[PDB]
Amino acid sequence: LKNKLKVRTAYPSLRLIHAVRGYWLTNKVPIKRPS
C-alpha cells in the first residue's frame, strides 16, 4: 500500500514546490547558487 503515496506526492507537493523553487532561483538567487 504505497502506490497511492507515489502519485499523491506527485501533486503540488513536488509539482508546485519544484516549480516555485525554479521561480525562486530565477528571482532572488544568483544563477542557481547562493551567490
Q: What are the binding residues for CMP-N-acetyl-beta-neuraminate?
A: 35
Q: Which three cell numbers stand for residue 18?
A: 519544484
Experimental method: NMR
Q: What are the binding residues?
A: 35
CB atoms within 10 A of CB 19: 11
**Could you tell me the sign of the dihedral formed by the alpha carbons of 13, 14, 15, 16, in that order?**
positive
Q: Which three cell numbers stand for residue 3?
A: 502506490
3-class DSSP string for 2-32? CHHHHHHHCCHHHHHHHHHHHHHHCCCCCCC
